Each structure stands twice: as structure tokens, then as C-alpha cells.
Amino acid sequence: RPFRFGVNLVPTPGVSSWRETCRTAEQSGYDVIAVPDHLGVHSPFIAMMAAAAVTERVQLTTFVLNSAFWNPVLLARDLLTAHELTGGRVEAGLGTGYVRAEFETAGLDWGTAGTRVTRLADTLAALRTLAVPTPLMVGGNGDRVLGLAAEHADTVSFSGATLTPGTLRMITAEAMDERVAFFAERAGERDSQVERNTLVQSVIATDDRAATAKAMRSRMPYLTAEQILQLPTLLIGTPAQMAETLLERRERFGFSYVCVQERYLAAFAPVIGLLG
Numbered sequence: 001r002p003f004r005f006g007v008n009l010v011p012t013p014g015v016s017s018w019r020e021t022c023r024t025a026e027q028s029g030y031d032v033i034a035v036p037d038h039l040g041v042h043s044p045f046i047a048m049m050a051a052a053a054v055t056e057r058v059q060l061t062t063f064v065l066n067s068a069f070w071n072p073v074l075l076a077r078d079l080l081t082a083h084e085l086t087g088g089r090v091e092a093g094l095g096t097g098y099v100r101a102e103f104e105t106a107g108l109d110w111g112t113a114g115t116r117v118t119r120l121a122d123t124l125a126a127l128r129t130l131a132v133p134t135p136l137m138v139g140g141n142g143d144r145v146l147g148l149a150a151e152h153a154d155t156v157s158f159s160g161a162t163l164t165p166g167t168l169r170m171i172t173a174e175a176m177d178e179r180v181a182f183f184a185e186r187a188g189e190r191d192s193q194v195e196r197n198t199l200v201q202s203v204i205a206t207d208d209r210a211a212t213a214k215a216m217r218s219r220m221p222y223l224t225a226e227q228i229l230q231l232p233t234l235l236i237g238t239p240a241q242m243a244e245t246l247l248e249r250r251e252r253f254g255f256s257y258v259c260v261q262e263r264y265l266a267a268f269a270p271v272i273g274l275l276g
């Protein structure tokens with residue numbers, strides 16, 4: 001599938017640069033602006049509308065909603081509105097949620113891993129029954145979550161890290177091979193209709209990839225330097241090397257929808273220039 005590039009921007013209360021940041025993303029060649037769903041961050045659909053008002057080309061996506069924060073019928077109303085009032089520019093990524101303190105602050109039941117995944121399942125089923133027009137993305141690497149992506153999603157987002165719900169660890173390329181294969185087996189005949197996304201956490205410009213990876217073992221001691229050089233959540237080297245890496249990873253994993261974090265917006269833009 002043709003590449004599409006996203007930048008995960010954090011609309012921040014008290015910071016007056018939202019419109020300028022969204023314009024920079026579009027001017028830098030990104031195809032998607034992605035926004036998160038967290039307490040203490042601006043409300044995602046309202047921020048996406050504010051982005052739509054100052055951009056013309058980019059798609060706007062939630063990346064990803066905390067399913068515990070949304071009533072499915074009311075979310076369906078939001079999605080239809082966002083779709084119609086932007087001219088079809090909105091996509092909705094969904095997840096189970098994972099920050100327990102935020103559930104507690106909002107007065108919501110943390111429950112169990114099972115109830116949190118079931119809430120995502122129930123929401124996805126409802127959104128499809130209500131025939132929402134926004135493309136749907138599902139994010140997360142748990143078995144049940146990838147099964148839901150395979151059943152319901154237009155895009156599956158493969159995480160690239162794990163944590164203990166209630167600390168972050170990057171997964172290896174080999175673990176990622178297995179998660180993509182699991183998804184594909186669950187998707188069956190629908191595999192070819194689901195776009196594959198991943199989020200790159202760090203985009204590290206360097207003229208010495210090997211020395212950089214060796215140094216980075218300090219922050220990820222559970223990995224070798226060779227594993228660090230193959231980690232799907234990291235891009236290391238020159239822009240030409242990073243472009244070649246993304247071509248190789250599209251072949252290996254099927255990743256054609258690549259997002260980066262806001263801090264690396266400018267660092268990654270040269271790669272967009274080379275892949276287009």
C-alpha cells in the first residue's frame with residue numbers, strides 16, 4: 001500500500017500554538033494529524049475541528065480514544081458530525097485505555113483487563129451497527145484487541161511497546177513479526193483490506209547508526225545493539241537510510257501508515273521528501 005505519514009500532535013491547555021503547529025505539520029508534507037485522548041490534554045474532536053479550520057489536505061485522526069471515556073451512541077453522533085462538518089476528513093482510532101489514574105479522576109470503573117477490552121468490543125460493534133462514515137482504526141497488541149481490529153477496523157495500529165497497566169518496554173522486530181502474523185491470521189480473507197500503522201517513537205539523525213545503537217543499549221539494556229537497529233519504534237541514520245529502512249519495514253511488516261511523535265516532526269520531514 002502507498003505510504004501515508006502522520007504526526008502525533010498534543011493540543012495542550014494553556015499553549016496558544018495549536019493552529020501554527022497544525023499548519024507546520026501540513027506544510028512539512030504530513031498526510032495525517034493525529035491527536036491523543038487523555039485528561040489534561042485538549043478534547044480530541046474539538047481540537048481536530050480547530051485543526052481542520054487551518055488545514056486543507058491532511059486527514060485528522062484520534063490516536064487513539066480511550067473507550068472508557070465514550071458512550072458508543074454519543075460517539076457515533078460525534079463521528080457523523082465530524083465527518084459531515086469537515087467534508088470527510090476525520091478518522092477514528094480507538095483503544096481500551098490504560099492510565100488507571102485517569103479512570104479514577106473521571107469516576108470510571110477501572111475494572112479488569114477483560115472488562116476494558118470488552119468495552120472496546122462493545123463500542124466497535126455499536127459503531128459498525130450505526131454505520132458511522134469515519135474510517136475506524138484499532139490500536140494495541142493484546143490478542144483480543146488485535147482480534148477486534150481484524151474483525152472491525154479499516155486500519156490496525158501495532159503498538160511497539162508494552163507496559164504494566166496500573167513501565168514502558170520496546171518490543172523486538174521478532175515479537176512484532178509474531179503480532180503482525182497473529183493479526184493476519186485473525187483477519188483471514190479481510191487481511192488485504194486493512195491498512196497497517198505503527199508509531200515510531202524516536203527519529204534519530206546520525207552519521208553513525210552503529211555507534212548510536214550501541215549507546216542506546218543504556219536506555220534499553222534488555223536488547224542488543226543489533227536488535228535496537230531493527231526495532232520498529234526507532235528510526236536511526238541519515239534520511240536516505242531511514243527511507244530505506246521504511247521501505248524494508250513495509251515489506252517485512254506491511255507498515256505503510258507511519259506516524260511519528262511531535263518532537264520529531266522536523267526530523268522526519270526529510271524522509272517524507274525522499275519517499276515522495
Ligand SMILES: C[C@H](OP(=O)(O)OC[C@@H](O)[C@@H](O)[C@@H](O)Cn1c2nc(=O)[nH]c(=O)c-2cc2ccc(O)cc21)C(=O)N[C@@H](CCC(=O)N[C@@H](CCC(=O)O)C(=O)O)C(=O)O
Nearest residue numbers: 036037063064066095096097139140141142162163164165
Ligand atoms: C496495556 C497494553 O495492552 P495493549 O493491548 O497493547 O493496549 C491496550 C491499550 O493500551 C490500547 O488499546 C490503547 O488504548 C492505547 N493507546 C492510547 N490509549 C489512551 O488511553 N490514550 C491515548 O492517547 C492512546 C494512544 C495510543 C496510540 C497508539 C497505540 O497503539 C495505542 C494507544 C500492554 O502493554 N499489554 C501487555 C500486557 C499488559 C499486562 O496486563 N501486563 C501485566 C504484567 C504484570 C502482571 O502480571 O500483573 C499487568 O500489569 O497486569 C501485552 O500485551 O504484553
